[PDB]
């Protein structure tokens, strides 16, 4: 169901989106960018690893598109983001560092959302 709070709440969360697609964050962001190209980088195991492959550019094409209907959606594909870097990396990659310290600005401020 749709609530009356649920455009401000996506406010917020494009908010959030446009905050780690910042170049404040853009040591740490990159590696989140754009879809995973595995061929490219020899991850040939990555799409048997991965079932459903998320980024950044991907939740940017959702919230322009009005693709997510509330807050708890759009949170949902940012964790799968990092949830996917998590599973297919070893945990002391430095990819998976930057994924925690993206996570840590994401969830911070995702716990400021207005109610
Ligand atoms: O989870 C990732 N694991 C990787 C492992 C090796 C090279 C690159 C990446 C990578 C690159 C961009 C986005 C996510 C990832």
């Known amino acids: 169901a749709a ?3 649920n455009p401000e709440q996506l406010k917020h969360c494009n908010g959030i989106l446009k905050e780690l697609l910042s170049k404040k964050h853009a040591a740490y962001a990159w590696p989140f960018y754009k879809p995973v190209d595995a061929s490219a ?11 459903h492959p998320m980024d950044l550019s991907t939740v940017k094409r959702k919230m322009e598109n009005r693709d997510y209907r509330d807050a708890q959606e759009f949170a949902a594909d940012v964790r799968l983001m990092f949830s996917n870097c998590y599973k297919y990396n070893p945990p002391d990659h430095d990819v998976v560092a930057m994924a925690r310290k993206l996570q840590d600005v994401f969830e911070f401020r995702y716990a400021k959302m207005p109610d």
């Open 41 to 51: 980088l020899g991850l040939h195991d990555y799409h048997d690893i991965i079932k």
């Open 3 to 5: 609530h009356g709070s």
